[PDB]
Ligand binder design. Structure first.
Ligand SMILES: NC(=O)C1=CN([C@@H]2O[C@H](COP(=O)(O)OP(=O)(O)OC[C@H]3O[C@@H](n4cnc5c(N)ncnc54)[C@H](OP(=O)(O)O)[C@@H]3O)[C@@H](O)[C@H]2O)C=CC1
Ligand SMILES: Nc1nc(=O)c2nc(CNc3ccc(C(=O)N[C@@H](CCC(=O)O)C(=O)O)cc3)cnc2[nH]1
Length: 151
């Protein structure tokens, strides 16, 4: 199984603001769609609320501790380990946040597909810091920039 993290962030690793994206970049959202299409996507419960509905054409997997919580069109597991365990037969799994999910996944992640933006936005939640000396930049397309890293 190839564990992959995908996230759009700024120079200070900001990702969210009051349970929302602090920006709107259609180019990044189209990039997110093509990358995630036809694959499992694991997300935190607040990230689902951020989206508002299941992402179409994709197996939406939602992590939560609420044991009676039901969600229409998503599979619910009670830990990241029960998610990865249930997707053992899968070839690739995509983690899309939020911060607590990203943090727990980072040490298990094989690949990273990250969008870095040359701007300083205001916010509250952030992407947890990786170690630049552990990763290798596979692809870097400068338009923001689509940055692919591989451990
Ligand atoms: N720019 C980007 O690429 C991204 C941005 N974001 C932004 O981040 C914000 C949402 O993310 P964030 O606020 O960090 O919250 P998260 O999406 O990380 O979700 C937190 C909640 O998910 C559940 N959860 C998380 N980890 C676990 C675990 N290990 N086991 C069981 N349950 C777990 C818990 O829900 P419960 O209380 O139900 O147990 C917890 O309260 C939004 O503003 C969104 O826009 C999010 C993803 C990507
Ligand atoms: N690179 C990247 N950018 C993001 O904005 C992003 N956002 C999340 C969490 N929040 C979101 C917010 C919006 C959509 C979303 O509307 N995506 C649609 C795009 C539809 C369209 O192109 O019009 C999708 O189909 O995936 C998904 C997740 C997780 N990873 C990300 N990764």
């Amino acid at each position: 199984m190839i564990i992959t993290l995908i996230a759009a962030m700024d120079k200070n690793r900001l990702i969210g603001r009051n349970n929302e994206l602090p920006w709107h970049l259609p180019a990044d959202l189209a990039h997110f769609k093509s990358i995630t299409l036809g694959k499992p996507i694991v997300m935190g419960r607040r990230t689902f609320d951020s989206i508002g509905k299941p992402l179409p054409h994709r197996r939406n997997i939602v992590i939560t501790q609420q044991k009676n919580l039901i969600i229409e069109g998503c599979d619910i597991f009670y830990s990241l380990d029960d998610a990865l365990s249930a997707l053992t037969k899968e070839p690739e799994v995509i983690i899309i946040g939020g911060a607590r999910i990203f943090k727990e996944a980072l040490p298990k992640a094989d690949k990273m597909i990250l969008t870095i933006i040359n701007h300083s936005f205001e916010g509250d939640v952030y992407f947890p810091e990786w170690n630049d000396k552990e990763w290798k930049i596979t692809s870097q397309i400068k338009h923001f920039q689509f940055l692919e890293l591989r451990r």
